[PDB]
Structures are given as structure tokens and as C-alpha cells.
DNA sequence: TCCGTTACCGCCATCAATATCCACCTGCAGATTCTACCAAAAGTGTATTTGGAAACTGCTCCATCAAAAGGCATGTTCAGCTGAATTCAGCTGAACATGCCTTTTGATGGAGCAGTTTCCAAATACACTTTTGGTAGAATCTGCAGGTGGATATTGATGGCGGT
DNA sequence: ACCGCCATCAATATCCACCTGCAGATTCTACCAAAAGTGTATTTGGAAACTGCTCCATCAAAAGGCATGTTCAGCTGAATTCAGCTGAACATGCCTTTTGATGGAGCAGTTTCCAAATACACTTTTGGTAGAATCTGCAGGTGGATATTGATGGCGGTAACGGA
């Protein structure tokens, strides 16, 4: 009725930023400014592994083809980082 | 009513000065006034478009800013 | 004869203060009504009848607002590449065609 | 008159949302102001008009125009000069201006544009000489005589503007401008015919027996016109004209040193009392659609071999005026710097040597000859005289007229004069006034002064005297004071072509009955 | 009893990330480790742009996050200006700059 | 037997639709490839906003409306009006017969 | 009817069953109407004959009897509408229109 | 082989007529290594897009369909190849 | 006696007989040797199709001749006839691609 | 022609009015904390199919050697020109004062916006049959490129008729 | 002797017509793997019908901005000149094209097999809306201390001048 689900990551965002600095604050458009941020770049991502998927008539979607997807569209200083903390991520979470 | 007069003198004025314009010529007002109302038109046909759609009588932000992001010009704040 | 000149400051000095006092400001510059008025005035050719909120008002504002800094900070290279001070309606219209609009 | 006078009333109309106001008759009671009716005594609209036009209330198109004039003053002494009203007013009456002339240009009238003369200054008798300037309040005298509020210690301003006035042709009985027909009643006592009923009778005006060329001529008139001629027709321009140069004032007069000077040198016997001199005016005329207009004329003064040291064998420019209205345009200058030449050679041929000129340009709102000079005709600057003036005197040295020219400093240092005697002295110079506000001392501060002055003045080196050309005694232009108030008595203003023309025509006129009653 | 994200060590919810990758229609199939990867990707760019607005908004005396410090932590980077070329930064502004030749003498 | 796998082509249509406005004129096997890649541009990109409509109304049936919309919001000027005419009468016959 | 297809109950020449099966292993979604196909074929086929309108007299006025790259070059370039909507499409021995400024001329 | 300097085989007869084809009346010798440099940065951007689509798909033989599907993204579609 | 034609004639006669032409004026040997080894840093023993050097070769020949035309519109901006790079950067700039 | 005299021009010096800077005080709303409450979501378990992978074999096409050559790449010389520096001459927006106005903020009356329930028409799935569109194979016809001859615009050089 | 504009002549380049050789376009013959139309059953999101309920649209005060009038000086445009620059032509020698042959790692097809996503059941938690209480950094207000532009004059440098 009121109360229905409107689900965004306010709480999220902001015990990240806890970590990094505890004395700060922000108080109300920084939140939609990151949220349409991560909205858009989540859109881009998706869209180009859906895309490079397609062009090689596979029926399943890994994380090789976002890993893909990654690295078109981030340049290379971003992308060693990116795949670095990917495979580290990977291998933890398949280790544990 | 005109309702084009509404881009006063100073306000073209004070917008121009944030470029580092020290010199404005008197007759730039007219092209860039037709270039703000062709701008405008394109992307008030799409929210439009956008609102017939949803068959909706009340236009919203969502429409202008999914417009928006098909011409290039993804919005960042007015996405939530 | 006469007294006269208590402080006259030469041409250009006020320019760049000013430049130097709007850089450092963000708050908006048209005003809300004269906007308004226009927008309806334009959407009244498309539809009749048609009410609009006012977050959508000011999104066009913002986007309208952006774009005209644009072209004249991109008309503001092509006027200092000519040798040149004054701004002449020549640099919109080249800044316009590169920009790939025109076609 | 409905079918000829509406395509104007229509294009008012059109213009949105300029019209708008004056669309419907103004409502006091609704509108907030209540005391319209105690400012407009006539108030009433394009709708008003619109109905008497169609009705035909209208004797001629002459009254529609005037009632259109009429509501444009209501409106502008009613709404400040701020108010958006006022400048759609104004901007109604600069459309109706060039849509009503073509109407009228049909018709067979002359123009249909509401022309009112130059505000006139007012004399007062605060001080015996003060002059009212314009838009000035002032105490009237039963409309007789006129008094300064500032020195005061009925009341009104100075903002009435004489309309022009309005001659009836003796054969169709239109009325219209006399300055844009050109008619005088003393070359034409039988009337004024218009040139649509000489057309159509095909008939000719009667030959203007008060032209310039029908004046007594003069040998340094003759020179200069034909200097000017030769010049011209070596230029070869398809819209030049013909050029009349003619001398009109010759006398002989003396000039009084003044007191200061008298006491230094004159009671020692170093110098003459007075000096002799021949003052001469000439002005320059061209034919231009068969009507003489003015456009260039000089005041002189000549000295002879008589006069006493060290005044000898010289001559000085009193003063130069203009008009920029010669065809062509680009020859103007060319004109000017041909008779600047051509007097130079004929007073070089008469013998003299020395020549000055004080290059003084006019302050705004005075004039040196020419009265009510044209708002398109910028003020030159005195750099851009004495540029003038060099190219004049190059051009001059170039045809071995002129052996050189020099500033007076230079020529002061060339001539090696110590005492300020050797000066020269000339009615109405600077020189004379420095001097006696300066009153070896008087000679350093002289020399200073002059020193600083030195690029205004120019100093021309030509090279017993006897001039065959009579003299013409003439008190209407002795000087041009009395120039300056004719002109402004009789309104004969320079502003527009067709005002010069007319004022040309006057001068000629006023110079022939003179001449011989 | 255990959640994913406490496993994986990750702040975000990754089952948010798999339920939007389900109703998302991207594919009828989907892996189980390329939400983690994605979130990953997605959190390292936003703890980026985050620690930059903190340094911006620290290099200006102030304790507190204004659009205007986000505009110069962007601006200030040629990666986030590429990357960022044509997205607008909602009162930013514009980077203060006058041309040398502009300069009187 | 063993033979290689066959491809797909639209070379026919496009030869029909060559005659009947140009019988006399002929076609070169290079603009083909032009051609195709140009229709499968706007089909694929035409596709793209139909779906993205779709998206925004949430609605999980696809149907003439959102793509009608994105051919309004798509083809620019009044060509895209011709093109719904053409497209509108279509769908309308489809529906007669 | 057994020999009345889809296709030609339309009216169209451009195929109808072709489209609709690409749009089902596009993965576009679970769902796809039946109405979509056929105005999407009419759309195809309408841009396709004023493509092939604008290369007509293109081709016409050099006399030429073949399709050269040149000519549909020219037919995109003169056309406000198409250049707005290709501006970003690069063409294939297309080359670039003639263009003589007045200033550069020797007056 | 590791070769290199193969941008000096740009030779001068073919940037010339490249100006030519522009419309340029005068020619500046100073810009053709300005050139050179500008055209680094394109090709780069190019072979990058069109190495991660060959390795993506695990290939060691790269197709022109990788080339044209990584151009079309990049705002630089092309026609005459399919696709 | 030579001719001599005066200079600015000629480049009427190349402007009109290029733009009437649409064939390659590029070499595809160093054209290829040069992608080969530009290719060869990012992997090595690399296998290419005969096609793909002449598809990559065809489209960026477009970049350069879309952008000659930029660059002399901008050079006639500023009264002259002569290109210079900073026509180029500007162009660039403009377009969104530098900045 | 050289030295005493003088006025003009310019370097640099303290200051006057204005602006910017920091320091202290005071009242206020968002951030922080705390409490309870409860429904949607996430955890495990079991069975089932299927998609990628293994080994094997056959088909393929690209680098390099090799040769004969005629046309284009490069060096050298000659000359016409067009961009940068100088000086001069006309003008419009910057910098003040003054009278007059409409932004901004303060509470309102009724038509769309949900909420809920039930029935309807299209979507999907399984089985049969005929058939149009790709293609291996082959034979046949023709418009287009090139050679050669002919006719016509176009341009520079030694003079020739007007102004200087 | 220069500068404009021009008739005449010899040499270039282009367009056109006639003729001939050939790779590409066109048409039978047929093919069984795959597509589509037809015949049934079933289920589910949306429309109709009723309701309660907010939020956009329409009037009133007082003063920091908004438009006019006046004056001017750095800014922009025009005429003149000179020397390093590139463009053209001729001679001489290297460089890409094409066709032939050969060797083998990469790619494609086939069968069977193993682990993971998915449809249900169950339960135990955890963040969002609600409330209240508390504090502290920050927006105005006032008060003194230095930094900046600039007209102006004392006096040195210097050029011009006149008598010896």
C-alpha cells in the first residue's frame, strides 16, 4: 500500500564511506549522483557482456564474459586492478 | 504572449561571463536563443513521446531523464 | 579646473574579478517563472491540457543551463585560436558544424 | 483615401503585441488611471480613425495623418519615458514613418513625415547676454518676453517646437511642405504651382532669377570655380555636379590692439597702433537636381603691403565650416582641399607669403557658419583636422604652390624672433587673449604656451599689393554673428538636404534684394 | 543461517545482485560467481569515487560533501574525465582557466 | 555425406523489391553487403528501444504500442510518420485477412 | 488454406516467420507478440524503398546503368533527414562531397 | 619477427594526395609527424578492442567481424561486410 | 620555355580529378607489415585473415578525409589559408574526443 | 661650432579610500542514539538432464624462394610571392548616479490515483504433411574497357590602342 | 616606360565514335532438412465497477535589482614592404606483381560421461516506519589589521637653443 518496496542503497553506500573517512558527511544529492552513477555504469556492463555473449551463440554467461566486458570497456590502469580484485574475489569465495 | 523575452540581457550576460568572455558582441543573442529553442524542441518531442506511452497525463522526471540518456547526455542526481 | 577621479578602474580589471566570483559560485542563473512559461508555451503545440512537476521543470533547466556553458567554453577555444578578443557569431556557428549537429 | 491610407493602418494593426494597447479606446475607470482625461484633452484610438475613415469624416488624408501624430504626442506626454508604452509608441511611429511615405509619393504629395524645427535658444535679461538653453524652464511674459529661473531670485518650459509650415498650390489646392517643394513667394509672386499640374499641362517652372550663378562675380571667384571644375571633370564622376565659387563680402576694416599691449609697446612707439586689413567671405555652391545648395564657405583676413610691421604680406583663416551633403561624397574632401589650394595660389599670385590657420574644431552644439549642423555629421576631432590639414598642405607642396609649411613653434625658431612684437596678431585670435591673460618673463611664458599649442596652428611660407576684384559692403554677413542669427530667426536650418537646399535658396534670395533693392 | 556476502567478505548484498540478474532477462542462465564479480567491480569504482570526493571536499577546509567537490575530484583526474566525457555533474561547475595569450602585455 | 552449413541471405527480397520500381535497372553484389548491414543496423537498433520502452512500462508482453513508440521516438521528422502510415495500414490488413 | 501464408496475407514481400524466429532466439524476452513482425516488415521495407528512391536518381543523372558506392554516398549526403539519422556511419568508397570556399577563390 | 618504424612508410606523395582529397589549397611541411603521432593513439584503441574480442572467444585467427562489432560500439559503424 | 603556371592553378586540376575517384592511395604491404607489428606487442604469433587488413585499412582512411575538411573550415576561420596543428587539436578538443 | 640655461618627460616615494581577512558570540535543526515489531528472504535437501570435454582423423592454405622489368622516387636549380612589423585613425562598451517595480512566501477547492475481485480471450505445446528457398552442376550471351583517329576550347608571347 | 585589355598563333588536353575480346549474370534439375498452418486442451493479466483521498491553481506586502543618460581610450582595421619558402622540370636507378610448389598445426565432426541449476517444503532472522531525547557545527552580527590602485610631484636625464 504506503509502504511498498523501494529498496536503493542508502545504507550501503554509506558504511562504505565510513571506512574511508569517518568524519564526513553527505547530506542529500550526493546519494542520487552515486546511485545514477552505478545505475548507469551496471547498465553499461550488462549491456556489452549481453552483447559480446551473443556474438558467440553461448546459452550461459559467466564471469569470463563480464570479465570481458570489463576490460573493453575500462582501459588498462583500471583494468589490472579490476581483474586482480576479480580473481582474488573468485578465488576466495571458491576457496571458502 | 512572446514568452521569449524571458532571456534577459544580464542573464545572457552573467552565463557568457562563466566561459572567461571579456568582450560580447551585440548580436549573438538571437542565434543562441534559436539554438536553445531547437535544442529544447528535441528532447521536449521525446518526453512527450515518453509520456503518451504510459498513457499517463502527468509527465515526470524518468521520461526526461531516460531521453536523455538515448542522445549521449545521461543525467546524474535525478536517477532515484 | 576642477576635482574630479575619486577611483576609476581601467577597462577589463572588474571582468575578472567578477569571472573570479561566478567560478566559485554553482547556484542557478534563469529564473524559475519566465522558464516555466516558456516550457508551457512549447508543449502546447505537441498537447493540450497537460500539467508538469516541478523536478521535471528544473531537470530541463539544469540540462539547458549545461549546454550553453558548453558551446561557450567550446566557442572560447576557437575565438583565442583566431587571433582574436571579441567573440563573433562565426565561432558558434563552426563550434556548432565540428560538433557534428549540423547534419 | 480608405484604399490608399489603409495598407498603413493594417500594418499598424499587425504588429503584435506592439498595437495592443491602442487597439481599444483607453478606459481611466478600469485601468487604474483616473486622470487621463486631466492630461489628454483629445483621448481616442486607431478604432476612432478606422470608423471616420470609413464613414469619410476625412477632407484629406492631410487631417488622418496629423490625428495619427496627434495620438502619438498623447501617448508619449502622457507615459514616462520608461514605460513599455512609451517605447511601443515609438517604435509605431518609426513603422508609420516609412509605410506613410510611399502613400503620399503616390498621391502626388511630397512626404508624409511630421518635421518640426530646432528648438530656438531664448534671450534673457538676467545678465543682458544670457542665452536660455534647450528644455530649460523659464518665467514668461504675457508670452512677449522670456526670464531665467536661476537668476530670478507665468512659469514655463522650453520645449515648444515651431511645426513647419504648409504652402496650398493655386491650381489643385493640395497642401503641403514649402522646404520640400522649394517655393519663395518673392521668385514666384504669382504662386506656387505643384509639379503634377506642370506635368500634365506640360509646363516648366519659371528660370530662378536668384541663383547663385546670377550673382556679380568675382576674379578669385572665378579661379576657384574653375579650379574646380578642371579638377572635376579630370575625376571624370557620372553624379558630380556643377560647382559655383563666388566671393560675396569684400571690405576694408581695422584692427585695435588691446589695452595690455598698447601699454607695453605701443606707448613706447615699438608698434603701430592698428593695423588695416580686407576681410573677404566667399561660399562654394552646387547644382544638385537643378537647385543650388550650399555646402563650403570661409571668413579671411588679408594683409596688405600697407600695413604696418610685422603684419606684412600675410593672410589668416577666421574660421572654417561644412556641410556633408556634396555629391559625390568621396570627392568632398577632394573639392575642399581644391579650393583650399586654389585660394592659396590666387593670394600667392597676389603676392603674399605668410598664411595661418588655427585648426579649433567646434564645441558640440556650436556652430562656426553653418547653423544646425546634421546629427550624421560627426565633430572632427583636432587630430583629425590637423591631419586634414597636412595632407592639404602636402597636396598643396606637391604642385609647387606651396614651398613648405611648418607649426609655429618652427617657425618662431626660424625666424628667430626674441620680443613678443614679431608675433602675429589677428582679430578673434588665441594669440592676442594668451597675451594679455599672460599680463624676459612674458617671453618664456609666451614661448611655453606656444610651444605647447603648436600642433593646433600651421604656418604656411607662399613665396605693392592691389586687388582688382571691388568691394561688396554687406552688413547680413559681417561676421558670422549676424549670420548665426539670421539663420536661427528665420529657421534656416541645415539638418536634412531639403532644409539646406531651402536655406541656401534663402541666402540667395536675402543676397539678391540686398544687393539691389 | 550464513549469508553470502559474510562468506564472501563483500559489503554489498550479493543476492540482490543475483535476484536483479534473474529478473534482468540478460540470459536463462546465469552463473553464481559473476554477480560477486560484478559487485566487486561495482564497489571498487564506487570506494574510487568516493575516497576522491573525500580528498576533494578535505582540499577545500570543509568536512562536508558538496556536488562542487565532486565536480573538481572528476574534473581533476583525466581518467574520470574520459570515462565521465559525456555525463554532467549536476551544479559543478565549471574548472577555473585563462588562456595565457589573454593576459595583457 | 558431409557438406559445409548453409547461410542465410535476404538476396531474394531485395531482388523483388528492386523490380518493380527499377525493372531495367540492376544491382551489383557489393551494395548488398551495404544494404544488409544498413536493415540489420535498424532492426537491431530499432529492436533495442522497443525493448527499453517495454522495460519501462514493466510490461511483460510485447506488443505493437512500445514499438510504435519507438519508431515515433526513433526516425526523425515526419519520414517516421510515413513509415507508421505504411507500418499502421500493414498491421491493418494483417488483421483483415 | 494450406498455401496462404502469413507473408502474403500482409502483403508484404519481406518475410514475416524469419523475423519473428530471430526475435525469439534474440533472448529479448520469454515473451513475443504476434503483431510485432509485420510492422516491423513494413517498416524494413518502406526505408528500404526510399533508400532505394534516393539512389535512383542518384544513379540516373550520371549516366550510369550501375550501382556505384558514389552514388549512394550522394543520396545520403544531399538528404538533411538521412545525414541527421547516419551521422555517425562510415561508408565504403563513399568519398566526400566538392566543396570550394569563396574566400580561398583568387579574387 | 619484432620489426619496427613502419610509420615513416606513410610516404609524403600520400599524405599530400590525402590533403589533396580534403580540399586543402596550401600545405604546412611541419604537420605529417603531427599526424603520425594523432594516428597512434586511433590505431591503438583499435587493435585493443580487436584483441579482447579475439581472445575472448578463445581463437588464435582474428576475423573482420571482431574488428567491425568492437567499431560499431565505438561510434564508427560500418557497412559492406554484413553484421 | 617552360609554362610555368601561376601558383594555386594546379590545385584546381587535383581537387577535381580526386574527388571523381574512390580507389585506395595507400600501400597494403607497409600498411600490413605496420598493423603487424603494432598488433604484436599485445600478443605474439598471431594469424590474421586476409580481410581483416583491408577492412581495418578501409575504415580508418574515413578518419583522416572526415576530418580534412574540419581542419580547413577551422584554418579559413582564422582569414588564412594554411592548416596548421592547432586546427587539428581544436577539432578535437571540440568533438569530445581529447576533451 | 661648443657650453650654460631651461623646460619636458619619466622613476619612484609616502599615502587615501576601499576591500579582504580573522576572531568571538548566539541561537537552531539534522545527525546520532535508543526501543519495539514483523513479514519477505535466505539457508538445506533430493532428483534430474544436459552442456562442455576426452581422443581420433581428415582437409586446408600461407611463408619463402625465384625471376624480369618499366615507371616513379630523389637530387638540383630557378624564381614569384605572401606573411610579419610599423604607423596611423575612428569608435563603442565600461563606469557612475537615480527613479521605479515585481520576486518570494503565505492556505486554500475537486478530478485522477490506487485497491479489490472475477471472467475472458490469447499464448503455448504436440503431431503431420507439403514445400520454397540455398545450392552442386553446367551451358549461354553481352555490356564495358581499351586502341586510334578527328575535332575543338584554352593559354602564353611579340605587339597595339587608351591614361600617367 | 607602366598598367588594362586584347586579336592572333602554336601546342595540350579532352570528348566522341567505331571496333573487338571476356568474366559475370541468367536459367534448368533437383534435393530432403527444416518451417508453417491446422487441430485441441488449459491458464492468467487486464478491464469494469465501485470507493476514499490529496495536490495544483488563484490572491496580497515592501525594497534590492532594472533600465537611461553621459563620457572616453584601448581596440580594430587599412596601406606598405621584403626575403625564406615551395613548386616545377629533368635525369637515373631500385621495387612491387604475379605465378608455382610444398609442408603440417589448427579447425570441425562424433560419442559418452559428470557436476550444477532448478522446483518445492520448512524455519529464523533484520531492516524500514514509528516514536522521543540530546547535542553541536554553522549562518549572522560586530570589531580591528594590512594589501591594492593610482593621481601626483621632487628631481635626474636629456634635447634644443643661442651667443661666443
Redo the contacts with the bound molecule.
Keep these: 500500500?504506503?509502504?511498498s518496496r523501494?529498496?536503493s542503497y542508502?545504507?550501503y553506500v554509506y558504511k562504505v564511506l565510513k571506512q574511508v573517512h569517518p568524519d564526513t558527511?553527505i547530506?542529500s544529492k550526493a546519494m542520487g549522483i552515486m546511485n545514477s552513477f552505478v545505475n548507469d555504469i551496471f547498465e553499461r556492463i550488462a549491456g556489452e557482456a549481453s552483447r559480446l555473449a551473443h556474438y558467440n551463440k553461448?546459452?550461459?554467461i559467466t564471469s569470463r564474459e563480464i570479465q570481458t566486458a570489463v576490460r573493453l570497456l575500462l582501459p588498462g590502469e583500471l583494468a589490472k586492478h579490476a581483474v586482480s580484485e576479480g580473481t582474488k574475489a573468485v578465488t576466495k569465495y571458491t576457496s571458502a | 504572449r512572446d514568452n521569449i523575452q524571458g532571456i534577459?540581457?544580464?542573464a545572457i550576460r552573467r552565463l557568457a561571463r562563466r566561459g572567461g568572455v571579456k568582450?560580447?558582441?551585440?548580436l549573438i543573442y538571437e542565434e543562441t536563443r534559436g539554438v536553445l529553442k531547437v535544442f529544447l524542441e528535441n528532447v521536449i518531442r521525446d518526453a512527450v513521446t515518453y509520456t503518451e506511452h504510459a498513457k499517463?497525463?502527468?509527465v515526470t522526471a524518468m521520461d526526461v531523464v531516460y531521453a536523455l540518456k538515448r542522445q549521449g547526455r545521461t543525467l546524474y542526481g535525478f536517477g532515484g | 579646473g576642477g576635482v574630479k577621479?575619486?577611483?576609476?578602474?581601467?577597462?577589463?580589471?572588474?571582468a575578472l574579478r567578477e569571472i573570479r566570483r561566478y567560478q566559485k559560485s554553482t547556484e542557478l542563473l534563469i529564473?524559475?517563472?519566465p522558464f516555466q512559461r516558456l516550457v508551457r508555451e512549447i508543449a502546447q503545440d505537441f498537447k493540450t491540457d497537460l500539467?508538469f512537476?516541478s523536478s521535471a521543470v528544473m531537470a530541463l533547466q539544469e540540462a539547458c543551463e549545461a549546454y550553453l556553458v558548453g558551446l561557450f567554453e567550446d566557442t572560447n577555444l576557437c575565438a583565442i585560436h583566431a587571433k582574436?578578443?571579441?567573440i563573433m557569431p562565426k565561432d558558434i556557428q563552426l563550434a556548432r558544424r565540428i560538433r557534428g549537429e549540423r547534419a | 483615401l480608405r484604399q490608399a491610407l489603409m495598407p498603413t493602418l493594417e500594418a499598424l494593426y499587425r504588429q503584435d503585441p506592439e498595437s495592443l494597447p491602442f487597439r481599444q479606446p483607453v478606459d481611466p475607470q478600469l485601468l487604474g488611471i483616473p486622470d487621463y482625461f486631466d492630461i489628454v484633452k483629445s483621448p481616442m484610438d486607431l478604432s476612432t480613425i478606422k470608423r471616420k475613415l470609413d464613414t469619410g469624416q476625412y477632407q484629406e488624408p492631410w487631417q488622418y495623418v496629423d490625428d495619427i501624430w496627434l495620438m502619438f504626442n498623447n501617448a508619449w506626454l502622457y507615459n514616462?519615458?520608461?514605460s513599455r508604452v512609451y517605447?511601443y509608441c515609438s517604435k509605431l511611429s518609426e513603422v508609420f514613418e516609412q509605410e506613410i511615405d510611399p502613400v503620399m509619393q503616390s498621391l502626388g504629395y511630397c512626404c508624409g513625415r511630421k518635421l518640426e524645427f530646432s528648438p530656438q535658444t531664448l534671450c534673457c535679461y538676467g545678465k543682458q547676454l544670457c542665452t536660455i538653453p534647450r528644455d530649460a524652464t523659464y518665467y514668461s511674459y504675457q508670452n512677449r518676453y522670456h526670464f531665467c529661473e536661476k537668476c530670478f531670485n507665468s512659469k514655463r518650459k522650453n520645449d515648444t517646437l515651431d511645426p513647419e509650415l504648409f504652402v496650398e498650390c493655386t491650381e489643385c489646392g493640395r497642401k503641403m511642405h514649402q522646404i520640400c517643394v522649394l517655393h519663395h513667394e518673392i521668385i514666384w509672386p504669382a504662386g506656387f504651382v505643384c509639379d503634377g499640374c506642370l506635368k500634365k499641362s506640360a509646363r516648366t517652372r519659371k528660370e530662378n532669377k536668384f541663383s547663385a550663378k546670377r550673382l556679380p562675380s568675382t576674379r578669385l571667384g572665378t579661379f576657384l570655380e574653375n579650379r574646380v571644375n578642371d579638377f572635376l571633370r579630370?575625376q571624370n564622376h557620372p553624379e558630380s555636379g556643377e560647382v559655383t565659387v563666388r566671393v560675396v563680402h569684400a571690405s576694408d576694416k581695422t584692427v585695435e590692439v588691446k589695452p595690455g599691449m598698447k601699454a607695453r609697446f605701443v606707448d613706447s612707439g615699438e608698434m603701430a597702433e592698428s593695423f588695416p586689413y580686407r576681410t573677404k567671405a566667399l561660399f562654394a555652391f552646387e547644382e544638385i537636381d537643378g537647385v543650388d545648395l550650399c555646402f563650403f564657405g570661409m571668413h579671411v583676413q588679408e594683409y596688405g603691403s600697407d600695413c604696418p610691421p610685422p603684419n606684412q604680406r600675410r593672410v589668416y583663416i577666421s574660421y572654417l565650416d561644412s556641410v556633408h551633403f556634396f555629391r559625390p561624397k568621396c570627392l568632398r574632401t577632394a573639392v575642399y582641399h581644391e579650393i583650399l589650394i586654389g585660394y592659396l595660389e590666387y593670394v600667392k599670385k597676389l603676392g603674399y607669403t605668410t598664411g595661418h590657420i588655427w585648426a579649433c574644431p567646434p564645441s558640440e552644439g556650436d556652430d562656426y557658419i553653418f547653423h544646425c549642423h546634421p546629427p550624421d555629421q560627426?565633430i572632427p576631432?583636432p587630430?583629425?583636422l590637423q591631419?586634414w590639414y597636412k595632407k592639404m598642405l602636402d597636396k598643396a607642396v606637391s604642385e609647387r604652390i606651396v614651398h613648405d609649411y611648418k607649426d609655429i613653434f618652427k617657425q618662431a625658431?626660424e625666424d628667430?624672433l626674441t620680443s613678443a612684437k614679431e608675433l602675429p596678431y589677428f582679430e578673434g585670435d588665441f594669440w592676442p587673449n594668451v597675451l594679455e591673460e599672460s599680463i624676459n618673463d612674458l617671453s618664456?611664458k609666451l614661448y611655453?604656451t606656444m610651444?605647447?599649442h603648436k600642433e593646433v596652428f600651421f604656418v604656411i611660407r607662399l613665396i605693392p599689393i592691389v586687388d582688382p576684384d571691388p568691394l561688396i559692403p554687406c552688413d547680413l554677413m559681417d561676421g558670422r554673428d549676424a549670420f548665426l542669427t539670421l539663420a536661427r530667426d528665420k529657421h534656416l536650418e541645415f539638418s536634412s538636404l531639403r532644409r539646406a537646399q531651402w536655406s541656401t535658396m534663402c541666402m540667395l534670395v536675402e543676397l539678391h534684394t540686398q544687393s539691389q533693392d | 543461517?550464513?549469508?553470502?556476502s559474510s562468506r564472501a567478505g563483500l559489503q554489498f548484498p550479493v543476492?540482490?545482485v543475483h535476484?536483479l540478474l534473474?529478473k534482468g532477462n540478460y540470459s536463462e542462465?546465469?552463473?553464481?560467481g559473476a554477480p560477486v564479480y560484478l559487485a566487486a567491480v561495482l564497489e571498487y569504482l564506487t570506494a574510487e569515487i568516493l575516497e576522491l570526493a573525500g580528498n576533494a571536499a578535505r582540499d577545500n577546509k570543509?568536512?562536508?560533501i558538496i556536488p562542487r567537490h565532486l565536480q573538481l575530484a572528476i574534473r581533476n583526474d583525466e581518467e574520470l574525465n574520459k570515462l565521465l566525457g559525456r555525463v554532467t555533474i549536476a551544479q559543478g561547475g565549471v574548472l577555473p582557466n585563462i588562456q595565457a595569450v589573454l593576459l595583457?602585455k
Design positions: 500500500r504506503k509502504r523501494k529498496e542508502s545504507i558527511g547530506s553461448r546459452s550461459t | 534577459t540581457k544580464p568582450r560580447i558582441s551585440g499517463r497525463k502527468t | 577621479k575619486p577611483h576609476r578602474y581601467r577597462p577589463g580589471t572588474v529564473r524559475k517563472l500539467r512537476q582574436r578578443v571579441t | 514616462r519615458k520608461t517605447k579630370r560627426k576631432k587630430k583629425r591631419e625658431t628667430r618664456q611655453a610651444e605647447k | 543461517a550464513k549469508t553470502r543476492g540482490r535476484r534473474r542462465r546465469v552463473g553464481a570543509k568536512t562536508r595583457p
